[PDB]
Structure 1
């Protein structure tokens, strides 16, 4: 569970800071949620939780619902947020975010 990996309190506060549509800043989210104090192995564990269909990649649908991954109470990302995140994250251009790509997003926060 996400709350097994990260602190519910940290999650609450990170979600709480990006309540308005278009306010998402992945670096600051990653920082607040506690993903910057996690080992690479824990990072990968988070990734697997986010990859809803276990395809090994975070596709557009899972990307839009990334916050729901952390707390089912969270909003979906707006269109500009999804577009912006995919663009920061997709280095090989397949339109998806793989494990390494996700790890890099986190590491650069």
Structure 2
């Protein structure tokens, strides 16, 4: 489960900051949930959870469910939030996010 990687305390606080539609701030979210200070291996484990079908990429549909990846009862991102986040993490141009792109996105501040 995600609490095997991050504290429930930090997850509830991070999720709690973005309960409104179109409120997602990825830099703020990753910092609050505590994964910015995790090892590159733990970040990869977080990536595996988010990459729902395990094909190696977080596509847009999986991305919309990112919050649920940390907390099951979380909302889905709005279509606008998903498109904006994908633009932010997809830097090699294929419309999805791979593990190296994910570590780069999380490393931002």
Confirm or deny a common fold (TM above 0.5): yes
Residue matched to 1:61:
61
Distance in structure 1 (CA, Å) of the matches to 2:66 and 2:47: 10
Question: What is the deviation of 1:48?
Answer: 0.5
Residue deviations 1:63-92 (CA, integer Å, cap 9, x gap): 000000000110000111111111011111
Tell me how many residue pairs correspond in the alignment.
109
Question: What is the deviation of 1:93?
Answer: 1.1
- Other structure's SS at 2:48 match: helix
Q: 8 Å contact 2:22–2:80 — kept in the other structure?
A: yes
With the length of structure 2 as denominator, give the TM-score of the two structures.
0.97
Q: Once superposed, what is the RMSD of the aligned Cα atoms?
A: 0.7
Distance in structure 2 (CA, Å) of the matches to 1:17 and 1:76: 14
Extract structure 1 runs of 4+ deviating beyond 3 A. none
Is there any run of 5+ residues in structure 2 with no aligned partner, and where? none
With the length of structure 1 as denominator, give the TM-score of the two structures.
0.97
